Design an enzyme around this catalytic site. Structure first.
Site, PDB file in Angstrom:
ATOM      1  N   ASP A 253      33.459  34.288   4.114  1.00  0.00           N
ATOM      2  CA  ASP A 253      34.806  34.490   4.598  1.00  0.00           C
ATOM      3  C   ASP A 253      35.766  33.685   3.742  1.00  0.00           C
ATOM      4  O   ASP A 253      35.525  32.491   3.503  1.00  0.00           O
ATOM      5  CB  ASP A 253      34.928  34.060   6.063  1.00  0.00           C
ATOM      6  CG  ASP A 253      36.134  34.690   6.759  1.00  0.00           C
ATOM      7  OD1 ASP A 253      37.267  34.283   6.446  1.00  0.00           O
ATOM      8  OD2 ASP A 253      35.943  35.579   7.636  1.00  0.00           O
TER       9      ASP A 253
ATOM     10  N   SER B 294      40.542  36.695  12.698  1.00  0.00           N
ATOM     11  CA  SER B 294      40.809  35.342  12.234  1.00  0.00           C
ATOM     12  C   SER B 294      41.149  34.407  13.387  1.00  0.00           C
ATOM     13  O   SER B 294      40.327  34.277  14.286  1.00  0.00           O
ATOM     14  CB  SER B 294      41.807  35.335  11.093  1.00  0.00           C
ATOM     15  OG  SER B 294      43.067  35.778  11.532  1.00  0.00           O
TER      16      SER B 294
ATOM     17  N   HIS C  63      38.132  38.968   4.344  1.00  0.00           N
ATOM     18  CA  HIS C  63      38.749  38.312   5.485  1.00  0.00           C
ATOM     19  C   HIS C  63      39.360  39.342   6.428  1.00  0.00           C
ATOM     20  O   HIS C  63      40.271  40.070   6.036  1.00  0.00           O
ATOM     21  CB  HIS C  63      39.839  37.356   4.999  1.00  0.00           C
ATOM     22  CG  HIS C  63      40.399  36.497   6.089  1.00  0.00           C
ATOM     23  ND1 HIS C  63      39.596  35.731   6.907  1.00  0.00           N
ATOM     24  CD2 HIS C  63      41.664  36.351   6.555  1.00  0.00           C
ATOM     25  CE1 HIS C  63      40.344  35.122   7.814  1.00  0.00           C
ATOM     26  NE2 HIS C  63      41.601  35.480   7.620  1.00  0.00           N
TER      27      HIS C  63
END
Ligand SMILES: [Cl-]
Length: 358
Positions: free
Chosen positions: A247, A139, A296
């Site tokens: 995502d 991320s 994610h």
């Protein structure tokens, strides 16, 4: 045995609240492979956003409550069953406590300096002898790899360690600066289009971007360099890109909120197009692993060995990419040849790939 917390010796490099920054290390003296993982978890881009983040998510702004040890999971695990090719590496987890997408040089934003300092310290803990340093992240960490990998490579070259081959692994850090599905006014971290958020963030953080990328965009429009498809072409270091086609964080910043119930048509179109556009940004990135899933992050998750694209698992794709680059040399015509490449799903909806995680 777990990774062990070390707080940075240089006291002037700190988390957001002034507490010292740090890294967790599990040493493997029989290996010359080093994996440095950059944690993610958004950002904050002005005083009120950051005050609010200090109250709700203090761990991401402070080292005060960090435990003394962390078990390595996924790509940071030392168990062969969990990490089939790289279980024996030296493992480093750098907590994210800078809220600045690893770009920073009242609250302090020092993400870029944190990474620089960790690398400096590790040189005295065995890194001077390494053959390979993989800079990895999930991320905001994945985006941090793109923003920092060339600087790490330069830092080691300049310190006289040119033989350490630097590569990057960016997981869930490749976002589109597309339109939102539904415009919000920049109020919150989740009510702000990524384009506006980073533009304000950079100024508030004194964020820096790679020099080559900065030169290709107008003065003052460095925010472009936070977007994978814009910065990737300008990168010197090979970077393997891991990215779910759908995502959750991309949906979030486009102001799509799934209930799980049947989706309206306007929103069906958005999803179809996200996947299509993301596939397009990756068509010339052969070191790519992009499953059609709504998820994610993946690489420090235990189940990262179970996802497959076109018959190939992620650990294996990575191991083939890394090994073939490492042996390659200036005379090599096609370094990645014989590796499975362009591992991008073409199917059009979340979970059309049967191996998606739950
Ligand atoms: Cl896990």
């Amino acid at each position: 045995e777990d990774l062990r917390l070390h707080l940075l010796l240089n006291t002037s490099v700190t988390c957001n609240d002034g507490s010292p920054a740090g890294y967790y290390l599990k040493e493997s003296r029989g290996s010359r492979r080093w994996l440095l993982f950059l944690e993610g978890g958004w950002y904050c881009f002005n005083r009120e956003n950051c005050d609010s983040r200090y109250d709700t998510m203090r761990r991401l702004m402070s080292s005060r409550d960090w435990p003394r040890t962390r078990t390595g999971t996924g790509i940071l695990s030392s168990q062969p069953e969990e990490n089939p090719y790289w279980w024996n590496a030296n493992m480093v987890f750098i907590p994210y406590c800078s809220s600045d997408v690893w770009s920073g040089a009242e609250y302090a934003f020092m993400g870029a300096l944190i990474i620089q300092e960790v690398v400096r310290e590790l040189l005295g803990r065995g890194l001077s002898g390494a053959k390979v340093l993989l800079l990895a992240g999930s991320s905001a960490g994945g985006t941090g790899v793109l923003l920092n990998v060339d600087r790490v490579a330069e830092q080691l070259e300049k310190l006289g360690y040119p033989a350490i081959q630097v590569r990057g692994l960016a997981d869930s850090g490749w976002f589109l600066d597309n339109k939102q599905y539904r415009h919000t006014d920049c109020v919150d971290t989740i009510t702000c289009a990524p384009t506006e958020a980073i533009r304000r963030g950079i100024r508030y953080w004194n964020g820096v971007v790679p020099e080559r990328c900065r030169r290709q965009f107008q003065e003052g429009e460095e925010w472009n360099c936070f977007f994978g498809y814009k910065v990737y072409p300008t990168l010197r270091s090979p970077v393997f890109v891991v990215q779910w086609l759908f995502d959750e964080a991309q949906l979030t910043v486009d102001n799509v909120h799934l209930t799980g119930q049947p989706v309206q048509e306007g929103l069906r179109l958005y999803i179809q197009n996200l996947g299509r556009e993301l596939r397009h940004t990756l068509k010339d990135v052969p070191a790519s692993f992009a499953p059609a899933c709504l998820s994610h992050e993946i690489i420090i998750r235990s189940h990262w060995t179970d996802v497959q694209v076109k018959g190939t698992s992620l650990p294996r794709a990575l191991h083939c990419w890394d090994r073939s680059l490492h042996d390659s040399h200036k005379a090599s015509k096609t370094p990645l040849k014989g590796c499975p490449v362009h591992l991008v799903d073409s199917c059009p909806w979340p979970h059309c790939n049967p191996s998606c995680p739950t």
